[PDB]
Amino acid sequence: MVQQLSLFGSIGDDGYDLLISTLTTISGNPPLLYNSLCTVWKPNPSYDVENVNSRNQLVEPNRIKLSKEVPFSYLIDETMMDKPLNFRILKSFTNDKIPLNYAMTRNILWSLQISDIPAAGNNRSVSMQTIAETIILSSAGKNSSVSSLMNGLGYVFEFQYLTIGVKFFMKHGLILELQKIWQIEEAGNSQITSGGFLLKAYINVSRGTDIDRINYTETALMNLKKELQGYIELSVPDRQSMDSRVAHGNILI
Amino acid sequence: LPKINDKRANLMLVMLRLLLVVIFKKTLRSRISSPHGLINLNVDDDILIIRPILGKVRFANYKLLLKKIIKDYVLDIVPGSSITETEVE
Amino acid sequence: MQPPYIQERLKSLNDIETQLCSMLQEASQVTFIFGELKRGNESVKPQFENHVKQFYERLDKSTTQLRKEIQLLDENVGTNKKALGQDTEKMEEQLDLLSAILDPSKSK
Amino acid sequence: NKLSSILQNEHDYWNKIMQSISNKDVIFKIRDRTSGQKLLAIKYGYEDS
Amino acid sequence: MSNQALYEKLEQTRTILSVKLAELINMTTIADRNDDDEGSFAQENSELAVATTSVMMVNNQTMQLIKNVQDLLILTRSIKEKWLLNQIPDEKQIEELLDNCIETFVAEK
């Protein structure tokens, strides 16, 4: 469980290369390639959860995220082994098509994660969100599989998507991510972040009670934002967009 | 006048510089690997400069001493003993 | 050494201030000639037109070229890093020295 | 005349500076502690290595 | 920023042109003009203050020309400084090399 303090933004791919150089001028570090695959699961509507205390609202149903890393050998087509595995490959990832299709992901079926809507009030300068996390290491039995496990808990699959981007590690534990997101269905693959990169700068705090640390984290994030003034505008997203409860449906992408 | 061990001292200096460079590379790799990890070098673990050279020299000395001991107590006493020397990675 | 683009940029700038110096010098000669023109000898009258014309054409195109340079500044935007490899190159040279130490036939 | 003589003197020093300086290197301007003016400085340490 | 420098050089050039025309007309009609017609407007009322106004013109044109030229030169150097500063930009053989080095040291130690 962490308090994640975050700021968001977006950029057009035209400046992409330039942006990268500037980051290396500041951090002093080179970018590192990465990828991931997230699957979202929701409580089964076939089961009537009368246990939701309607007269008191002790709790509301929520959605579970399962993440995993996928090797690049599934994301590189027959035209791309010649180039080395570095960040420049992202320049060729502008098409809505991608080597990883629905059948391979179905064949695949980790990190389990749950979150809450950010803190209310208009006196917050950065998006503060609470995250509860655990890890699944292995399994066994006659039906050892992620799908069977989540159906045993009482959850069913809803959708999935694939993230590819680069990471920058700066001082004080600040992490800056440049991402491209591909939604995947049997109908096909569609790039929601079409013609651009999604930028997200964030820090993690282990204990929410410590307030000196939280103040330091906010100071670092606002200093970073004030450093990038004039190039990219980093902003607090909409509090109602980062809500992932089942009752109301929307997805920040 | 060129002495016998001048090349020895030059080699010592060269490997000391190489070990310092290796230390720097290890530091940079650890820094890039993860942001949270505070980069505070441990004298017992990270700093390895004189340890390899001193270990090699003293290991050679002990190898010679045990060779002499085995020769005196086994080779000189029990004829026909066959000795094979190996290194294990 | 610097990349060539900066080299011709600095050459153009140097040409700019040399042209400015030439403009100042020509101002000096035109001020000189006007004195004797006011004195009353008409022999150097034809030279006056040439001096004035060259002075004005030196004043104009210099500013024009400087304007072009400042314009180049407009589109040139968007177009310790060495440390990231610095240790590496140091590493390389050190081993090279060892090679020179390792081979006694090359120490001459 | 005075302006031309002085001015060509600083072009002489200017050309000396331009053709004496080589280049990758971390170069910036700093304010001297004693003088207080702006001077060119180069970072050559292993701090970032 | 750069647009401000553009504008500043603009008044720099127009001021050069205007002061040039002013000193030209002043020195050309420095010979005082007497015309009986009322249309002409040239007055020399107090004798020596005429020379005072003349040296006034001299000092003004000198100071303004020198200042403008020096400002332009400083501007050019500033541009060049901005140009310079702001524009942000086998293993196996080593294995036998170190093996020979270490065995040589062991033999020589």
PDB file of all heavy atoms in Angstrom, chain C residues 9 20 24 34 56 59 63 66-67 70 73-74 76 79 81 95 98 102, chain E residues 2 6 9 17 20 27-28 69 72-73 79 83 87 89 94 97 101:
ATOM      1  N   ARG C   9      28.180  29.676 -39.000  1.00  0.00           N
ATOM      2  CA  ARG C   9      27.452  30.707 -38.266  1.00  0.00           C
ATOM      3  C   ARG C   9      28.405  31.761 -37.714  1.00  0.00           C
ATOM      4  O   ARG C   9      28.174  32.969 -37.864  1.00  0.00           O
ATOM      5  CB  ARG C   9      26.636  30.072 -37.139  1.00  0.00           C
ATOM      6  CG  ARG C   9      25.400  29.322 -37.610  1.00  0.00           C
ATOM      7  CD  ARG C   9      24.253  30.271 -37.924  1.00  0.00           C
ATOM      8  NE  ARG C   9      24.350  30.838 -39.266  1.00  0.00           N
ATOM      9  CZ  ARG C   9      24.085  30.174 -40.382  1.00  0.00           C
ATOM     10  NH1 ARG C   9      23.685  28.914 -40.360  1.00  0.00           N
ATOM     11  NH2 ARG C   9      24.221  30.796 -41.551  1.00  0.00           N
ATOM     12  N   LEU C  20      30.368  46.069 -40.337  1.00  0.00           N
ATOM     13  CA  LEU C  20      30.085  47.234 -39.499  1.00  0.00           C
ATOM     14  C   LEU C  20      31.306  48.142 -39.386  1.00  0.00           C
ATOM     15  O   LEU C  20      31.185  49.373 -39.451  1.00  0.00           O
ATOM     16  CB  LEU C  20      29.619  46.786 -38.113  1.00  0.00           C
ATOM     17  CG  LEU C  20      28.336  45.960 -38.088  1.00  0.00           C
ATOM     18  CD1 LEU C  20      28.022  45.489 -36.677  1.00  0.00           C
ATOM     19  CD2 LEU C  20      27.181  46.755 -38.674  1.00  0.00           C
ATOM     20  N   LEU C  24      31.685  52.078 -40.541  1.00  0.00           N
ATOM     21  CA  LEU C  24      32.236  53.174 -39.746  1.00  0.00           C
ATOM     22  C   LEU C  24      33.377  53.870 -40.478  1.00  0.00           C
ATOM     23  O   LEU C  24      33.464  55.106 -40.491  1.00  0.00           O
ATOM     24  CB  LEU C  24      32.715  52.661 -38.391  1.00  0.00           C
ATOM     25  CG  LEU C  24      31.656  52.135 -37.429  1.00  0.00           C
ATOM     26  CD1 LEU C  24      32.327  51.547 -36.204  1.00  0.00           C
ATOM     27  CD2 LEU C  24      30.713  53.257 -37.042  1.00  0.00           C
ATOM     28  N   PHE C  34      33.286  65.677 -47.122  1.00  0.00           N
ATOM     29  CA  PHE C  34      32.335  66.781 -47.052  1.00  0.00           C
ATOM     30  C   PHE C  34      32.997  68.070 -46.583  1.00  0.00           C
ATOM     31  O   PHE C  34      32.563  69.163 -46.966  1.00  0.00           O
ATOM     32  CB  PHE C  34      31.167  66.431 -46.134  1.00  0.00           C
ATOM     33  CG  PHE C  34      30.073  67.462 -46.134  1.00  0.00           C
ATOM     34  CD1 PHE C  34      29.140  67.503 -47.155  1.00  0.00           C
ATOM     35  CD2 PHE C  34      29.991  68.404 -45.120  1.00  0.00           C
ATOM     36  CE1 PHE C  34      28.139  68.455 -47.160  1.00  0.00           C
ATOM     37  CE2 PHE C  34      28.990  69.360 -45.123  1.00  0.00           C
ATOM     38  CZ  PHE C  34      28.065  69.384 -46.144  1.00  0.00           C
ATOM     39  N   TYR C  56      25.460  53.748 -47.916  1.00  0.00           N
ATOM     40  CA  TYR C  56      24.090  53.301 -47.672  1.00  0.00           C
ATOM     41  C   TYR C  56      23.925  51.818 -47.976  1.00  0.00           C
ATOM     42  O   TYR C  56      23.269  51.090 -47.215  1.00  0.00           O
ATOM     43  CB  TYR C  56      23.112  54.143 -48.488  1.00  0.00           C
ATOM     44  CG  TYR C  56      22.674  55.400 -47.771  1.00  0.00           C
ATOM     45  CD1 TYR C  56      23.365  56.594 -47.931  1.00  0.00           C
ATOM     46  CD2 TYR C  56      21.575  55.388 -46.922  1.00  0.00           C
ATOM     47  CE1 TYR C  56      22.970  57.743 -47.273  1.00  0.00           C
ATOM     48  CE2 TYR C  56      21.171  56.532 -46.260  1.00  0.00           C
ATOM     49  CZ  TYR C  56      21.872  57.707 -46.439  1.00  0.00           C
ATOM     50  OH  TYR C  56      21.473  58.847 -45.780  1.00  0.00           O
ATOM     51  N   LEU C  59      25.346  49.916 -45.150  1.00  0.00           N
ATOM     52  CA  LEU C  59      24.485  49.970 -43.976  1.00  0.00           C
ATOM     53  C   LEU C  59      23.288  49.034 -44.100  1.00  0.00           C
ATOM     54  O   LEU C  59      22.866  48.443 -43.101  1.00  0.00           O
ATOM     55  CB  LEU C  59      24.012  51.405 -43.740  1.00  0.00           C
ATOM     56  CG  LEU C  59      22.911  51.621 -42.702  1.00  0.00           C
ATOM     57  CD1 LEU C  59      23.398  51.234 -41.315  1.00  0.00           C
ATOM     58  CD2 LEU C  59      22.428  53.064 -42.721  1.00  0.00           C
ATOM     59  N   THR C  63      22.601  44.898 -41.961  1.00  0.00           N
ATOM     60  CA  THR C  63      21.435  44.706 -41.111  1.00  0.00           C
ATOM     61  C   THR C  63      20.541  43.602 -41.656  1.00  0.00           C
ATOM     62  O   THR C  63      19.943  42.837 -40.893  1.00  0.00           O
ATOM     63  CB  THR C  63      20.652  46.012 -40.976  1.00  0.00           C
ATOM     64  OG1 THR C  63      20.096  46.371 -42.248  1.00  0.00           O
ATOM     65  CG2 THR C  63      21.560  47.129 -40.488  1.00  0.00           C
ATOM     66  N   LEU C  66      22.134  40.313 -40.668  1.00  0.00           N
ATOM     67  CA  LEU C  66      21.927  40.090 -39.242  1.00  0.00           C
ATOM     68  C   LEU C  66      20.485  39.688 -38.955  1.00  0.00           C
ATOM     69  O   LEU C  66      20.222  38.843 -38.089  1.00  0.00           O
ATOM     70  CB  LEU C  66      22.306  41.342 -38.452  1.00  0.00           C
ATOM     71  CG  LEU C  66      22.199  41.227 -36.932  1.00  0.00           C
ATOM     72  CD1 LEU C  66      23.159  40.171 -36.415  1.00  0.00           C
ATOM     73  CD2 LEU C  66      22.471  42.568 -36.276  1.00  0.00           C
ATOM     74  N   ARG C  67      19.538  40.279 -39.685  1.00  0.00           N
ATOM     75  CA  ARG C  67      18.138  39.888 -39.564  1.00  0.00           C
ATOM     76  C   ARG C  67      17.956  38.432 -39.967  1.00  0.00           C
ATOM     77  O   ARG C  67      17.200  37.687 -39.336  1.00  0.00           O
ATOM     78  CB  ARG C  67      17.272  40.805 -40.429  1.00  0.00           C
ATOM     79  CG  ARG C  67      15.785  40.536 -40.329  1.00  0.00           C
ATOM     80  CD  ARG C  67      15.281  40.876 -38.941  1.00  0.00           C
ATOM     81  NE  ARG C  67      13.905  41.350 -38.950  1.00  0.00           N
ATOM     82  CZ  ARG C  67      12.841  40.565 -39.020  1.00  0.00           C
ATOM     83  NH1 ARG C  67      12.957  39.248 -39.088  1.00  0.00           N
ATOM     84  NH2 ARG C  67      11.629  41.111 -39.020  1.00  0.00           N
ATOM     85  N   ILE C  70      19.166  36.304 -37.045  1.00  0.00           N
ATOM     86  CA  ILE C  70      18.195  36.254 -35.955  1.00  0.00           C
ATOM     87  C   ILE C  70      16.996  35.403 -36.351  1.00  0.00           C
ATOM     88  O   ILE C  70      16.400  34.713 -35.515  1.00  0.00           O
ATOM     89  CB  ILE C  70      17.775  37.669 -35.524  1.00  0.00           C
ATOM     90  CG1 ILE C  70      19.006  38.530 -35.246  1.00  0.00           C
ATOM     91  CG2 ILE C  70      16.927  37.601 -34.270  1.00  0.00           C
ATOM     92  CD1 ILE C  70      18.678  39.947 -34.834  1.00  0.00           C
ATOM     93  N   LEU C  73      17.887  31.857 -35.833  1.00  0.00           N
ATOM     94  CA  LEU C  73      17.654  31.521 -34.431  1.00  0.00           C
ATOM     95  C   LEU C  73      16.237  31.005 -34.207  1.00  0.00           C
ATOM     96  O   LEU C  73      16.015  30.128 -33.364  1.00  0.00           O
ATOM     97  CB  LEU C  73      17.918  32.732 -33.534  1.00  0.00           C
ATOM     98  CG  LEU C  73      19.345  33.266 -33.434  1.00  0.00           C
ATOM     99  CD1 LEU C  73      19.378  34.544 -32.616  1.00  0.00           C
ATOM    100  CD2 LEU C  73      20.224  32.216 -32.791  1.00  0.00           C
ATOM    101  N   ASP C  74      15.265  31.540 -34.946  1.00  0.00           N
ATOM    102  CA  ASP C  74      13.869  31.182 -34.704  1.00  0.00           C
ATOM    103  C   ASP C  74      13.591  29.718 -35.028  1.00  0.00           C
ATOM    104  O   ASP C  74      12.905  29.031 -34.262  1.00  0.00           O
ATOM    105  CB  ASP C  74      12.946  32.094 -35.508  1.00  0.00           C
ATOM    106  CG  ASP C  74      13.112  33.556 -35.145  1.00  0.00           C
ATOM    107  OD1 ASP C  74      13.464  33.845 -33.983  1.00  0.00           O
ATOM    108  OD2 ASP C  74      12.892  34.417 -36.023  1.00  0.00           O
ATOM    109  N   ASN C  76      16.029  27.391 -35.494  1.00  0.00           N
ATOM    110  CA  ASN C  76      17.077  26.509 -35.003  1.00  0.00           C
ATOM    111  C   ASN C  76      16.743  25.874 -33.659  1.00  0.00           C
ATOM    112  O   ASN C  76      17.430  24.933 -33.252  1.00  0.00           O
ATOM    113  CB  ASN C  76      18.403  27.264 -34.904  1.00  0.00           C
ATOM    114  CG  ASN C  76      19.207  27.187 -36.182  1.00  0.00           C
ATOM    115  OD1 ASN C  76      20.114  26.366 -36.307  1.00  0.00           O
ATOM    116  ND2 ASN C  76      18.871  28.036 -37.146  1.00  0.00           N
ATOM    117  N   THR C  79      16.531  21.769 -32.822  1.00  0.00           N
ATOM    118  CA  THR C  79      17.471  21.081 -33.697  1.00  0.00           C
ATOM    119  C   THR C  79      18.880  21.106 -33.108  1.00  0.00           C
ATOM    120  O   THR C  79      19.638  22.050 -33.333  1.00  0.00           O
ATOM    121  CB  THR C  79      17.502  21.705 -35.101  1.00  0.00           C
ATOM    122  OG1 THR C  79      17.521  23.132 -34.990  1.00  0.00           O
ATOM    123  CG2 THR C  79      16.277  21.281 -35.897  1.00  0.00           C
ATOM    124  N   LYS C  81      26.882  14.686 -20.625  1.00  0.00           N
ATOM    125  CA  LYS C  81      26.667  13.576 -21.547  1.00  0.00           C
ATOM    126  C   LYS C  81      27.953  12.795 -21.785  1.00  0.00           C
ATOM    127  O   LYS C  81      27.937  11.561 -21.860  1.00  0.00           O
ATOM    128  CB  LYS C  81      26.097  14.090 -22.868  1.00  0.00           C
ATOM    129  CG  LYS C  81      25.765  12.992 -23.864  1.00  0.00           C
ATOM    130  CD  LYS C  81      25.142  13.557 -25.124  1.00  0.00           C
ATOM    131  CE  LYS C  81      23.723  14.027 -24.861  1.00  0.00           C
ATOM    132  NZ  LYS C  81      22.823  12.886 -24.546  1.00  0.00           N
ATOM    133  N   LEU C  95      43.816  -0.029 -20.507  1.00  0.00           N
ATOM    134  CA  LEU C  95      44.183  -1.348 -21.001  1.00  0.00           C
ATOM    135  C   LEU C  95      45.184  -1.242 -22.137  1.00  0.00           C
ATOM    136  O   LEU C  95      46.121  -2.047 -22.211  1.00  0.00           O
ATOM    137  CB  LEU C  95      42.942  -2.133 -21.427  1.00  0.00           C
ATOM    138  CG  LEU C  95      42.136  -2.737 -20.272  1.00  0.00           C
ATOM    139  CD1 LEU C  95      41.392  -1.699 -19.466  1.00  0.00           C
ATOM    140  CD2 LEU C  95      41.166  -3.770 -20.781  1.00  0.00           C
ATOM    141  N   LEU C  98      48.440  -1.108 -20.643  1.00  0.00           N
ATOM    142  CA  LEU C  98      48.847  -2.437 -20.207  1.00  0.00           C
ATOM    143  C   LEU C  98      49.416  -3.231 -21.374  1.00  0.00           C
ATOM    144  O   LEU C  98      50.451  -3.895 -21.235  1.00  0.00           O
ATOM    145  CB  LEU C  98      47.668  -3.175 -19.571  1.00  0.00           C
ATOM    146  CG  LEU C  98      47.986  -4.530 -18.931  1.00  0.00           C
ATOM    147  CD1 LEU C  98      47.284  -4.674 -17.592  1.00  0.00           C
ATOM    148  CD2 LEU C  98      47.607  -5.676 -19.853  1.00  0.00           C
ATOM    149  N   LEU C 102      52.693  -4.947 -21.562  1.00  0.00           N
ATOM    150  CA  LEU C 102      52.737  -6.402 -21.674  1.00  0.00           C
ATOM    151  C   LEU C 102      53.718  -6.855 -22.745  1.00  0.00           C
ATOM    152  O   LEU C 102      54.357  -7.905 -22.598  1.00  0.00           O
ATOM    153  CB  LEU C 102      51.336  -6.949 -21.957  1.00  0.00           C
ATOM    154  CG  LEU C 102      51.119  -8.463 -21.848  1.00  0.00           C
ATOM    155  CD1 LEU C 102      49.721  -8.755 -21.340  1.00  0.00           C
ATOM    156  CD2 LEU C 102      51.343  -9.154 -23.187  1.00  0.00           C
TER     157      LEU C 102
ATOM    158  N   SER E   2      13.962  37.100 -28.562  1.00  0.00           N
ATOM    159  CA  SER E   2      14.516  37.423 -29.875  1.00  0.00           C
ATOM    160  C   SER E   2      13.682  38.475 -30.602  1.00  0.00           C
ATOM    161  O   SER E   2      14.231  39.327 -31.311  1.00  0.00           O
ATOM    162  CB  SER E   2      14.634  36.153 -30.717  1.00  0.00           C
ATOM    163  OG  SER E   2      13.397  35.460 -30.763  1.00  0.00           O
ATOM    164  N   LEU E   6      14.791  42.023 -32.200  1.00  0.00           N
ATOM    165  CA  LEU E   6      14.407  42.481 -33.531  1.00  0.00           C
ATOM    166  C   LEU E   6      13.870  43.907 -33.484  1.00  0.00           C
ATOM    167  O   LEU E   6      14.317  44.774 -34.239  1.00  0.00           O
ATOM    168  CB  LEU E   6      13.352  41.547 -34.127  1.00  0.00           C
ATOM    169  CG  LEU E   6      13.774  40.118 -34.452  1.00  0.00           C
ATOM    170  CD1 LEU E   6      12.583  39.312 -34.945  1.00  0.00           C
ATOM    171  CD2 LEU E   6      14.863  40.149 -35.497  1.00  0.00           C
ATOM    172  N   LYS E   9      16.664  46.469 -32.623  1.00  0.00           N
ATOM    173  CA  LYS E   9      17.465  46.761 -33.807  1.00  0.00           C
ATOM    174  C   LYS E   9      16.679  47.600 -34.806  1.00  0.00           C
ATOM    175  O   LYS E   9      17.262  48.381 -35.560  1.00  0.00           O
ATOM    176  CB  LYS E   9      17.957  45.461 -34.447  1.00  0.00           C
ATOM    177  CG  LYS E   9      18.754  45.672 -35.725  1.00  0.00           C
ATOM    178  CD  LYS E   9      19.264  44.362 -36.288  1.00  0.00           C
ATOM    179  CE  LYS E   9      18.153  43.568 -36.934  1.00  0.00           C
ATOM    180  NZ  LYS E   9      18.690  42.351 -37.591  1.00  0.00           N
ATOM    181  N   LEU E  17      19.162  56.296 -39.303  1.00  0.00           N
ATOM    182  CA  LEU E  17      18.734  57.016 -40.502  1.00  0.00           C
ATOM    183  C   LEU E  17      18.299  58.440 -40.173  1.00  0.00           C
ATOM    184  O   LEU E  17      18.672  59.394 -40.871  1.00  0.00           O
ATOM    185  CB  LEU E  17      17.597  56.260 -41.183  1.00  0.00           C
ATOM    186  CG  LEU E  17      17.898  54.807 -41.540  1.00  0.00           C
ATOM    187  CD1 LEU E  17      16.653  54.139 -42.082  1.00  0.00           C
ATOM    188  CD2 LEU E  17      19.038  54.728 -42.543  1.00  0.00           C
ATOM    189  N   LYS E  20      21.238  60.595 -39.097  1.00  0.00           N
ATOM    190  CA  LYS E  20      22.035  60.844 -40.287  1.00  0.00           C
ATOM    191  C   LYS E  20      21.434  61.972 -41.107  1.00  0.00           C
ATOM    192  O   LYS E  20      22.129  62.924 -41.465  1.00  0.00           O
ATOM    193  CB  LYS E  20      22.140  59.566 -41.119  1.00  0.00           C
ATOM    194  CG  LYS E  20      23.056  59.676 -42.323  1.00  0.00           C
ATOM    195  CD  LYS E  20      24.495  59.896 -41.896  1.00  0.00           C
ATOM    196  CE  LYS E  20      25.419  60.002 -43.097  1.00  0.00           C
ATOM    197  NZ  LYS E  20      26.816  60.310 -42.693  1.00  0.00           N
ATOM    198  N   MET E  27      24.459  70.275 -41.305  1.00  0.00           N
ATOM    199  CA  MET E  27      25.751  70.711 -41.825  1.00  0.00           C
ATOM    200  C   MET E  27      25.610  71.363 -43.196  1.00  0.00           C
ATOM    201  O   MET E  27      26.382  72.263 -43.543  1.00  0.00           O
ATOM    202  CB  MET E  27      26.743  69.548 -41.886  1.00  0.00           C
ATOM    203  CG  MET E  27      26.405  68.440 -42.864  1.00  0.00           C
ATOM    204  SD  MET E  27      27.643  67.131 -42.773  1.00  0.00           S
ATOM    205  CE  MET E  27      27.011  65.981 -43.982  1.00  0.00           C
ATOM    206  N   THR E  28      24.641  70.913 -43.998  1.00  0.00           N
ATOM    207  CA  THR E  28      24.469  71.506 -45.322  1.00  0.00           C
ATOM    208  C   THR E  28      23.944  72.934 -45.227  1.00  0.00           C
ATOM    209  O   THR E  28      24.492  73.841 -45.865  1.00  0.00           O
ATOM    210  CB  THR E  28      23.543  70.644 -46.180  1.00  0.00           C
ATOM    211  OG1 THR E  28      22.353  70.336 -45.448  1.00  0.00           O
ATOM    212  CG2 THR E  28      24.244  69.360 -46.608  1.00  0.00           C
ATOM    213  N   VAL E  69      26.238  52.296 -32.562  1.00  0.00           N
ATOM    214  CA  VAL E  69      27.152  51.308 -33.134  1.00  0.00           C
ATOM    215  C   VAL E  69      27.651  50.351 -32.058  1.00  0.00           C
ATOM    216  O   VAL E  69      27.706  49.126 -32.264  1.00  0.00           O
ATOM    217  CB  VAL E  69      28.313  52.008 -33.859  1.00  0.00           C
ATOM    218  CG1 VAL E  69      29.284  50.977 -34.397  1.00  0.00           C
ATOM    219  CG2 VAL E  69      27.777  52.870 -34.986  1.00  0.00           C
ATOM    220  N   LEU E  72      24.991  47.875 -31.147  1.00  0.00           N
ATOM    221  CA  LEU E  72      24.843  46.840 -32.165  1.00  0.00           C
ATOM    222  C   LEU E  72      25.937  45.785 -32.048  1.00  0.00           C
ATOM    223  O   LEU E  72      25.673  44.582 -32.169  1.00  0.00           O
ATOM    224  CB  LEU E  72      24.845  47.471 -33.554  1.00  0.00           C
ATOM    225  CG  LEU E  72      24.574  46.522 -34.720  1.00  0.00           C
ATOM    226  CD1 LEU E  72      23.191  45.912 -34.594  1.00  0.00           C
ATOM    227  CD2 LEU E  72      24.714  47.258 -36.038  1.00  0.00           C
ATOM    228  N   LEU E  73      27.178  46.220 -31.819  1.00  0.00           N
ATOM    229  CA  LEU E  73      28.275  45.263 -31.671  1.00  0.00           C
ATOM    230  C   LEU E  73      28.063  44.355 -30.462  1.00  0.00           C
ATOM    231  O   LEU E  73      28.275  43.131 -30.542  1.00  0.00           O
ATOM    232  CB  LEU E  73      29.601  46.014 -31.555  1.00  0.00           C
ATOM    233  CG  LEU E  73      29.971  46.841 -32.785  1.00  0.00           C
ATOM    234  CD1 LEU E  73      30.987  47.907 -32.422  1.00  0.00           C
ATOM    235  CD2 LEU E  73      30.508  45.939 -33.884  1.00  0.00           C
ATOM    236  N   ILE E  79      24.516  37.467 -29.363  1.00  0.00           N
ATOM    237  CA  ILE E  79      23.939  36.437 -30.221  1.00  0.00           C
ATOM    238  C   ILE E  79      24.918  35.285 -30.394  1.00  0.00           C
ATOM    239  O   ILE E  79      24.537  34.110 -30.324  1.00  0.00           O
ATOM    240  CB  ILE E  79      23.529  37.036 -31.579  1.00  0.00           C
ATOM    241  CG1 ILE E  79      22.438  38.089 -31.391  1.00  0.00           C
ATOM    242  CG2 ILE E  79      23.067  35.940 -32.529  1.00  0.00           C
ATOM    243  CD1 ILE E  79      22.160  38.906 -32.632  1.00  0.00           C
ATOM    244  N   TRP E  83      24.537  31.392 -29.272  1.00  0.00           N
ATOM    245  CA  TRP E  83      24.775  30.308 -30.222  1.00  0.00           C
ATOM    246  C   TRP E  83      25.677  29.239 -29.624  1.00  0.00           C
ATOM    247  O   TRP E  83      25.381  28.041 -29.705  1.00  0.00           O
ATOM    248  CB  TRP E  83      25.392  30.867 -31.503  1.00  0.00           C
ATOM    249  CG  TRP E  83      24.422  31.045 -32.622  1.00  0.00           C
ATOM    250  CD1 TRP E  83      24.055  32.219 -33.212  1.00  0.00           C
ATOM    251  CD2 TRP E  83      23.692  30.016 -33.294  1.00  0.00           C
ATOM    252  NE1 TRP E  83      23.143  31.985 -34.209  1.00  0.00           N
ATOM    253  CE2 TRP E  83      22.902  30.637 -34.279  1.00  0.00           C
ATOM    254  CE3 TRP E  83      23.629  28.624 -33.158  1.00  0.00           C
ATOM    255  CZ2 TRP E  83      22.057  29.918 -35.121  1.00  0.00           C
ATOM    256  CZ3 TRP E  83      22.790  27.915 -33.994  1.00  0.00           C
ATOM    257  CH2 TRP E  83      22.017  28.562 -34.965  1.00  0.00           C
ATOM    258  N   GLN E  87      22.714  25.953 -27.441  1.00  0.00           N
ATOM    259  CA  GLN E  87      22.304  24.888 -28.360  1.00  0.00           C
ATOM    260  C   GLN E  87      22.695  23.540 -27.761  1.00  0.00           C
ATOM    261  O   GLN E  87      23.812  23.039 -27.916  1.00  0.00           O
ATOM    262  CB  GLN E  87      22.907  25.103 -29.741  1.00  0.00           C
ATOM    263  CG  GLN E  87      22.096  26.059 -30.616  1.00  0.00           C
ATOM    264  CD  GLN E  87      20.648  25.625 -30.791  1.00  0.00           C
ATOM    265  OE1 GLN E  87      20.338  24.434 -30.804  1.00  0.00           O
ATOM    266  NE2 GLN E  87      19.751  26.596 -30.916  1.00  0.00           N
ATOM    267  N   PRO E  89      22.970  19.664 -27.369  1.00  0.00           N
ATOM    268  CA  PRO E  89      23.049  18.486 -28.240  1.00  0.00           C
ATOM    269  C   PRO E  89      22.126  17.362 -27.780  1.00  0.00           C
ATOM    270  O   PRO E  89      22.516  16.567 -26.923  1.00  0.00           O
ATOM    271  CB  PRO E  89      24.517  18.072 -28.126  1.00  0.00           C
ATOM    272  CG  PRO E  89      24.923  18.524 -26.768  1.00  0.00           C
ATOM    273  CD  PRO E  89      24.146  19.782 -26.490  1.00  0.00           C
ATOM    274  N   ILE E  94      40.448  -9.051 -24.083  1.00  0.00           N
ATOM    275  CA  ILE E  94      40.689  -8.529 -22.744  1.00  0.00           C
ATOM    276  C   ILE E  94      40.890  -9.676 -21.766  1.00  0.00           C
ATOM    277  O   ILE E  94      41.688  -9.582 -20.826  1.00  0.00           O
ATOM    278  CB  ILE E  94      39.521  -7.621 -22.322  1.00  0.00           C
ATOM    279  CG1 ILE E  94      39.301  -6.529 -23.373  1.00  0.00           C
ATOM    280  CG2 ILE E  94      39.770  -7.030 -20.946  1.00  0.00           C
ATOM    281  CD1 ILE E  94      40.497  -5.645 -23.612  1.00  0.00           C
ATOM    282  N   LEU E  97      44.322 -10.975 -22.219  1.00  0.00           N
ATOM    283  CA  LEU E  97      45.220  -9.918 -21.765  1.00  0.00           C
ATOM    284  C   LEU E  97      45.379  -9.954 -20.248  1.00  0.00           C
ATOM    285  O   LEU E  97      46.500  -9.969 -19.726  1.00  0.00           O
ATOM    286  CB  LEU E  97      44.694  -8.557 -22.223  1.00  0.00           C
ATOM    287  CG  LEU E  97      45.721  -7.444 -22.431  1.00  0.00           C
ATOM    288  CD1 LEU E  97      46.501  -7.668 -23.713  1.00  0.00           C
ATOM    289  CD2 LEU E  97      45.039  -6.087 -22.445  1.00  0.00           C
ATOM    290  N   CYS E 101      48.602 -10.985 -17.939  1.00  0.00           N
ATOM    291  CA  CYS E 101      49.091 -10.029 -16.950  1.00  0.00           C
ATOM    292  C   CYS E 101      49.181 -10.666 -15.566  1.00  0.00           C
ATOM    293  O   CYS E 101      50.191 -10.516 -14.862  1.00  0.00           O
ATOM    294  CB  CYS E 101      48.184  -8.798 -16.923  1.00  0.00           C
ATOM    295  SG  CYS E 101      48.513  -7.667 -15.557  1.00  0.00           S
TER     296      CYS E 101
END
